[PDB]
Amino acid sequence: DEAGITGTWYNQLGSTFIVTAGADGALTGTYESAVGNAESRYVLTGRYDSAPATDGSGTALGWTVAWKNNYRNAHSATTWSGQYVGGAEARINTQWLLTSGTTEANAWKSTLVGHDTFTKV
Amino acid sequence: DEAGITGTWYNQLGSTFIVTAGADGALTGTYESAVGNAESRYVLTGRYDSAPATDGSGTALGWTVAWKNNYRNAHSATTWSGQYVGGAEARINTQWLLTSGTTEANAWKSTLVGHDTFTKV
Amino acid sequence: DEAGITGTWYNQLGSTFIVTAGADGALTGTYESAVGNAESRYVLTGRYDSAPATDGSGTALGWTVAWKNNYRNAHSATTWSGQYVGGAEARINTQWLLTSGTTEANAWKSTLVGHDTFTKV
Amino acid sequence: DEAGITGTWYNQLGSTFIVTAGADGALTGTYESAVGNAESRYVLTGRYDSAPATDGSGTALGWTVAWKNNYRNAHSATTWSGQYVGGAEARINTQWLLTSGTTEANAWKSTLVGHDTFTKV
Numbered sequence: 001d002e003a004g005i006t007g008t009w010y011n012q013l014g015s016t017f018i019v020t021a022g023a024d025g026a027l028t029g030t031y032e033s034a035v036g037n038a039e040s041r042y043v044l045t046g047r048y049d050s051a052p053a054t055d056g057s058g059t060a061l062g063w064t065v066a067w068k069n070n071y072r073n074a075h076s077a078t079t080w081s082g083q084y085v086g087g088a089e090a091r092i093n094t095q096w097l098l099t100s101g102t103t104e105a106n107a108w109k110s111t112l113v114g115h116d117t118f119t120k121v
Numbered sequence: 122d123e124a125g126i127t128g129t130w131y132n133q134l135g136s137t138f139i140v141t142a143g144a145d146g147a148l149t150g151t152y153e154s155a156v157g158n159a160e161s162r163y164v165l166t167g168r169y170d171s172a173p174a175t176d177g178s179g180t181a182l183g184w185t186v187a188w189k190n191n192y193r194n195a196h197s198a199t200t201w202s203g204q205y206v207g208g209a210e211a212r213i214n215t216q217w218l219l220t221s222g223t224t225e226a227n228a229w230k231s232t233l234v235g236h237d238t239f240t241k242v
Numbered sequence: 243d244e245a246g247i248t249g250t251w252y253n254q255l256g257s258t259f260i261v262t263a264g265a266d267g268a269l270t271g272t273y274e275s276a277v278g279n280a281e282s283r284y285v286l287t288g289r290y291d292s293a294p295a296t297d298g299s300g301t302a303l304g305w306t307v308a309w310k311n312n313y314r315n316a317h318s319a320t321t322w323s324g325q326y327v328g329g330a331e332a333r334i335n336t337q338w339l340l341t342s343g344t345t346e347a348n349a350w351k352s353t354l355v356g357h358d359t360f361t362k363v
Numbered sequence: 364d365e366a367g368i369t370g371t372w373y374n375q376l377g378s379t380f381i382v383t384a385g386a387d388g389a390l391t392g393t394y395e396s397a398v399g400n401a402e403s404r405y406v407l408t409g410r411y412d413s414a415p416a417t418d419g420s421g422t423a424l425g426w427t428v429a430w431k432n433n434y435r436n437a438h439s440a441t442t443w444s445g446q447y448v449g450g451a452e453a454r455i456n457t458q459w460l461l462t463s464g465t466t467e468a469n470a471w472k473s474t475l476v477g478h479d480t481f482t483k484v
């Protein structure tokens with residue numbers, strides 16, 4: 001799925017995920033969020049299963065974005081964890097964890113959880 | 122916290138996380154899990170906030186492991202999302218999402234969620 | 243939203259959630275899952291915000307199902323946490339945690355996480 | 364575990380959970396949080412597996428709190444999902460989802476996720 005994954009993907013929020021999949025399992029690219037304390041592109045990296053099961057199963061993958069770039073710093077990181085499902089309407093179906101840096105006293109409220117679905121259109 | 126983060130960390134399961142923090146926000150290294158469908162080391166990559174708040178707050182970070190290496194392939198990926206808290210007993214406090222590749226019919230049961238706390242000892 | 247919430251709801255898996263909302267914040271009813279180790283109806287209970295904000299915001303709510311009834315026992319419980327959004331196409335948008343009873347050694351893999359969207363049709 | 368569960372439990376934040384376990388799987392009680400937009404006690408309800416496995420496994424359970432009482436309304440609900448582990452130092456080990464009522468535009472940031480461990484002392 002190196003070919004399948006590589007490219008430009010869009011989620012339900014209107015965010016844009018630009019990724020390259022390496023033959024060795026790497027994911028590199030940029031993320032631009034349509035929401036939150038974010039502007040322009042941010043580095044991302046991740047990993048995917050470069051030899052998935054041949055049985056109909058999706059391809060596991062994940063990636064991280066730390067919310068610092070030359071424009072802003074939102075003192076946070078999101079990780080998406082999910083699977084790529086190939087075919088006529090290819091999708092990446094993810095769940096994510098967004099942890100902000102907090103004091104000890106606020107750690108209980110440090111982590112948001114949600115779900116993003118990415119499509120090629 | 123490039124110095125703070127860089128090195129060998131151990132969680133409550135007895136897993137070993139070996140990371141280098143780059144000046145530019147990169148995280149690279151290897152993960153070896155004490156549990157699950159896993160043996161030996163697996164590549165990991167991630168990101169962290171290289172200019173955290175100076176107010177007492179932790180440092181946001183995350184990383185991914187796809188569960189494929191030369192020994193096995195568990196057709197899955199974990200993402201940890203959390204924060205580094207520096208000082209006498211430094212910690213990385215994380216929550217994680219483990220997504221397995223599944224068919225459409227099994228997607229509902231694709232994703233495990235838990236929490237790992239990493240220490241230097 | 244006592245009137246709004248009360249009734250029969252269906253999710254994207256084809257599961258059926260039958261609830262009564264009490265004036266005092268109670269949720270009582272039955273759940274029947276279309277997937278998993280489940281058959282027929284199972285008791286559920288929960289709570290919702292009986293005096294929500296008047297600003298356009300959704301109405302917070304949650305409920306639990308333990309997966310035991312007269313037919314089976316799957317030694318697990320799901321909690322859904324989410325919000326009711328009223329209007330022409332009313333929805334309940336949830337995220338859920340399914341914890342199985344496990345030994346200590348398997349606790350790391352005890353908890354599934356997903357997301358369900360319920361509609362009146 | 365009706366006897367095991369029933370009573371007063373305390374988490375790592377200093378919150379107090381007072382529960383009765385019914386023979387039929389019910390959980391009823393009150394929760395008082397040490398943190399957040401909360402004061403005094405709030406109703407809770409939930410469910411647990413009243414006939415757990417005899418193999419060493421924990422007992423699955425969950426409960427909800429909507430954050431409305433006579434003192435305040437934080438327009439939110441938490442669900443804890445977890446397991447009771449009996450014996451010399453009994454514990455309830457949970458993960459939780461806290462959903463706030465939000466507008467559509469803020470739904471992405473509606474849900475916090477964390478983990479609480481409850482003890483009898």
Ligand SMILES: [Cu+2]
Pocket residue numbers: 052053194
């Ligand atoms: Cu295989």
Ligand SMILES: [Cu+2]
Pocket residue numbers: 073173174
């Ligand atoms: Cu700052």
Ligand SMILES: [Cu+2]
Pocket residue numbers: 294295436
């Ligand atoms: Cu209000």
Ligand SMILES: [Cu+2]
Pocket residue numbers: 315415416
């Ligand atoms: Cu059994």
